[PDB]
Amino acid sequence: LKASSLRALKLMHLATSANDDTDENVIALCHQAKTPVGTTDAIFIYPRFIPIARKTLKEQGTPEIRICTSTNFPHGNDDIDIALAETRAAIAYGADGVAVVFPYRALMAGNEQVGFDLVKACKEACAAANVLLSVIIETGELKDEALIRKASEISIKAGADYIVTSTGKVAVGATPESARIMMEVIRDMGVENTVGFIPVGGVRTAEDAQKYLAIADELFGADWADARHYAFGASGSLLASLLKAL
């Protein structure tokens, strides 16, 4: 568990636990990302806190820690104008990465077009600003393998730089099963170089993290899951469990 734990710590997007948030909590999160035995790849926070986070990260000597944030979140509504405006604002605040929630309920109702157009609009804005676009498909709500594959496919076709299981705000988050399905889509579409994978809302222990990294290594080889291709979107419990294991 030591090997997977250190690797997982470095791949974390250490996420706020707010629904809520304050400067004080975000500053604490920045400090927590500089762990006693390694530094996480990123933090994940609400957009309005990006400027204060950037300053905090610089002043503790870790300007390399990326700042990711959320849009169309957590509900994954259909409205592209709103999702796009939120994405443009996240970019203006200074985000390194934006995770947009796919309109998964629309897909569940049979509408494949809205998700394509919503992701594509957000990707165009992000790409222009050198911001990576993650797409959260909400596997715990989609539930069905065919729908999980379809949402992944549409997101990839529309330009997702990562596909992400979950918001962490619904009853069911990542499972090793949904992770496997999504990673198989990345392989089958031939986009393993351009699309990463992020489990959210199902990795709480070192033992969990080991299992998820094992899937990546099994499917793509041990060298694939670097920061550009893999992240753990998770909070303090996972981080504490990783540090304990270490």
Side-chain angles (χ1 to χ4, degrees), residues 4-17 29 32-35 38-44 64-68 162 197-200 203-206 209 213 225-227 230-243 246:
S4 58
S5 294
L6 180 61
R7 185 182 191 191
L9 183 154
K10 298 176 182 175
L11 294 169
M12 283 190 70
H13 291 183
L14 184 62
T16 180
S17 299
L29 193 75
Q32 188 175 209
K34 193 181 185 178
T35 94
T39 302
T40 67
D41 179 67
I43 61 177
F44 186 80
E64 71 278 7
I65 297 180
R66 290 170 59 84
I67 305 175
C68 305
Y162 296 82
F197 173 72
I198 307 179
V200 170
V203 186
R204 308 211 191 278
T205 64
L213 282 171
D226 59 19
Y230 202 97
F232 285 105
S235 80
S237 286
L238 180 57
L239 183 54
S241 181
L242 299 174
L243 290 172
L246 294 174

Side-chain angles (χ1 to χ4, degrees), residues 168-179 181-193:
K169 301 299 185 191
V170 296
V172 178
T175 69
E177 184 185 14
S178 58
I181 293 165
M182 293 178 68
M183 280 180 281
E184 285 169 357
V185 174
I186 290 170
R187 169 66 79 187
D188 292 349
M189 294 186 72
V191 297
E192 346 77 55
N193 67 317

